[PDB]
Symmetry: C3
Subunit: 183 residues, 3 copies
């Protein structure tokens, strides 16, 4: 029944374009064979803080990657900082870094690493979130399992938009999804 | 605690949007540790929002259903949802005693703070779309907001809206699932 | 043995018959979180009529249905599109070795989602979602899931897939979708 999370405060914990430019709020709750996931994003500074596609027509997407080793431990090339990711204790985290979280990893049979074998779309979940909570400011959140190199498991969030936003702050509504657990 | 707080799954009106008991809100909240798994649908049976005609009434485009809770997670009487059949599940009905404590089912206050002079972040909203009459060409938006009402310690608010011009369409919906971060 | 999960296994071995025998893999995982079932679904078509969609050549091919029919004990009936052989409780990445006898706690609730009758039919028993063919964001298809509307069974879950765009040689294999439903017990 346990939960891996980023504390749900607004303290930046994530680096998209520059150090600590964002707060990823991610909560993974183990419900047996499935992980129930809840995600939102606040960009606080830098390139993706205020979108202006009149000024910058090609600024239309970015990616946040969580890379994990064989024990389900977060690797430092991840966009999310290691100090910010742990099992929940109250509204905070355990003060000791976890050793094992394989039960939270995306299942490798469901979602295999890239190979020469046919690639299926099963390892992707699509959703839409809304910038500033406004229903006319959609952005697509594409979540992909186990497609990154340099790791045993991965979860990546690609944010993209097709509208021409003029001075829109990139901070989002929340989205829930699930995925099949490794064990 | 993997308990379920719900409205019961019957179709007996339990909700007051425009007039007394004009609707059945079916809401099921199931605790999976630090997240609440929520399932929701709505049937309007009477009054202003029962049969929508936007040719004759083009400005009838949205309405709101509020659930207000005290410090103990107990539903307040001024909610649109009636208190009588909002309780922990037993079979297809409820436990025989009104609950006194459900803080573990409340939306987390750090994730979703009450209104203040601090910046309001969008992460206290979840958007979804449901379909009137089960028809794929009859979308309506369900906007769910956590802890943005006053006169309570916690809240869940459902705003229903639509942009299509409906003509004599009965407002009864498909179901939507979401989750939120639990207070404890 | 995992008593809280009924699934198809996560492999890609065909287990489903839409238009011809074993033309598809339905990956379906039902996880009991008490009074709610958390469901995760995707579909891979490997052969036959629904494998490669070409609506220039075949303008009428726009939808199909996959039916799961259950008896009073929550056991899958053999007229379901999904095969009984690999629908079972989880054991690792496989299944428990004997066929299950009871799964009533995984069935969609009959008061929430009643069988057809003279009583008014409500839309509550439907969940709509959209999945994406080939993982491409410009290739939507609608997944309409309906609870307990089939005859000849105690319970049912049916998945209707449809699309409105004119696809030209698009393989029908989907992204994943999550939903939940109210459990019978
Ligand atoms: C699950 C069942 C279902 O989907 N039902 C839908 C049915 C059904 O498909 C058919 O009836 C068949 O049964 O169709 C409906 O629509 C068809 C008839 C009406 N219609 C609408 C359109 C869209 N346009 C016309 C148009 C619409 N607008 C509305 C304003 C603009 O849109 C927003 C906005 O403000 O930006 C979008 C935003 O998300 C809305 N917010 C919410 O919904 C909040 C939850 C917002 C809001 O509603 C208003 O602001 C409130 O006032 O509106 N303007 N103009 C025709 C059109 C053609 N295109 C181009 C591409 C078509 O779309 C796809 C694609 O196929 O490529 C669709 C695909 O899903 C997208 N992928 C993703 O989103 C990934 C997650 C892609 C992708 O975005 C791009 O490819 C980029 O990669 O685009 N666009 N518009 N046309 N016709 C119906 O019958 O009513 C809707 C039912 O919901
Ligand atoms: Cl655990
Ligand atoms: Cl009441
Ligand atoms: Cl045809
Ligand atoms: Na606007
Ligand atoms: Zn700013
Ligand atoms: Zn009516
Ligand atoms: Zn193929």
């Amino acid at each position: 029944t346990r939960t891996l999370w980023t504390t749900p405060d607004t303290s930046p914990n994530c680096t998209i374009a520059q150090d600590k430019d964002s707060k990823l709020t991610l909560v993974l709750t183990k419900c047996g064979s499935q992980i129930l996931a809840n995600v939102s994003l606040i960009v606080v500074a830098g390139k993706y803080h205020i979108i202006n596609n009149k000024t910058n027509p090609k600024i239309k997407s970015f990616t946040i990657k969580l890379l994990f080793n064989k024990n389900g431990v977060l690797l430092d090339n991840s966009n999310l900082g290691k100090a910010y990711w742990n099992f929940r204790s109250g509204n905070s985290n355990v003060s000791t870094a976890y050793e094992k979280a394989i039960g939270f990893m995306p299942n490798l049979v469901a979602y295999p690493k890239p190979s020469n074998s046919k690639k299926y779309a099963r390892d992707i979940v699509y959703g839409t979130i809304y910038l500033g909570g406004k229903p006319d400011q959609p952005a697509v959140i594409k979540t992909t399992f186990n497609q990154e190199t340099g790791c045993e498991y991965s979860i990546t969030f690609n944010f993209s938009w097709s509208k021409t936003y003029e001075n829109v702050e990139f901070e989002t509504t929340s989205f829930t999804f699930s995925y099949i657990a490794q064990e």
